Write a protein that binds this ligand. Sequence first.
Ligand SMILES: *Cc1cc2c(cc1C)nc1c(=O)[nH]c(=O)nc-1n2C[C@H](O)[C@H](O)[C@H](O)COP(=O)(O)OP(=O)(O)OC[C@H]1O[C@@H](n2cnc3c(N)ncnc32)[C@H](O)[C@@H]1O
Ligand SMILES: [Cl-]
Length: 385
Amino acid sequence: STHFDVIVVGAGSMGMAAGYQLAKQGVKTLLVDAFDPPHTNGSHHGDTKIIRHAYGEGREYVPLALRSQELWYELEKETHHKIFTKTGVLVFGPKGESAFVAETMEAAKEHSLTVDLLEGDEINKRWPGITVPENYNAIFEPNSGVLFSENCIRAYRELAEARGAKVLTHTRVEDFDISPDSVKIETANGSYTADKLIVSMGAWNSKLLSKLNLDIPLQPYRQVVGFFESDESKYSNDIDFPGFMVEVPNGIYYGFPSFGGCGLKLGYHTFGQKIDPDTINREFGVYPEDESNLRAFLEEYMPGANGELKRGAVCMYTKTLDEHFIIDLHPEHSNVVIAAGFSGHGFKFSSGVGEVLSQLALTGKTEHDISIFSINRPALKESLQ
Ligand SMILES: *Cc1cc2c(cc1C)nc1c(=O)[nH]c(=O)nc-1n2C[C@H](O)[C@H](O)[C@H](O)COP(=O)(O)OP(=O)(O)OC[C@H]1O[C@@H](n2cnc3c(N)ncnc32)[C@H](O)[C@@H]1O
Ligand SMILES: [Cl-]
């Protein structure tokens, strides 16, 4: 018998940030999650995530990245959990052969970001442990870095709960009932109503948005990461080894310096298995490519970080056809906000997205420019049932 102002379904990266923004304003909020965030069944575990400002996926993401960076610094001051370390982020690739490196460079120029440009041997010299061909160029962003994702979610949850937000864990939302003046969710643990709904179920958006009469192509992918024993005199965060996202002939890779001897962490971005979030095999090593795709990169570009595998993790990306996000009101219901398809690069923006989602839910509009994330854009291929 408890009505809420707002209900957030999926209290992960995006939902928990929204819950915190709403709670902070005194909005009576209920967050419902299938597990107990932060957990290891969605897209936010694996300990760390890169935050970059000069944006290779699109210069139009810069303001949101800069706003998110400021919000992460604010969160750092508000909690005892560690949130951000300024490792800097290095982007490199073959000169003239990487659209990713080119747009990162254009994005930095267009928004006057602070970056260092270097090439070939200058890269190897500046960061012992990296070995790239002489025809490679790079752009280094010293002020971006690494976020401790599980800590971010845990901190937003503690702060939101302290202000009255309620979080119903281990509860799967199974259906929705939307009316012009209210929303209702159905779960095995009971039904709940509110004035507004925010839907942010991550990989499960690909299976449950149909319950809101939405037919949007969303493909979940199994993406693994590995931590490798490394030469700490070269790859440690203590000796300024940077976070990185680079483009090589066979694709894009991203990584993190070793923190407190945990080993260098690496992931292969461009390849992953197409899967269903409810049947995905979350054990690292069950496919030979899990470990082999990573060592293929390490032995060539960071030879001293190709030691024993210390830990593996299996997480998911949910891609849209254009790999841009979906953040918008439901086309048929202004009282329903959708956050989906972060396509493998949404964590860094979760603080800013939480702000956008709270504004959309409370006012139906946002001060941020989110036109490129419209649920009505052609490149998405969106429609109703
Ligand atoms: C997987 C991955 C992603 C990733 C990355 C490396 C890997 C291996 N590296 C990144 C990086 O360096 N920088 C960056 O900015 N992003 C990076 N990413 C992507 C990022 O992690 C994802 O885009 C982000 O986490 C997406 O957030 P979202 O909030 O969409 O997803 P979630 O955190 O998984 O939360 C969804 C929640 O909803 C719940 N759920 C699901 N179904 C239900 C139902 N039916 N009822 C209630 N709750 C539901 C989940 O339990 C989950 O908590
Ligand atoms: Cl994603």
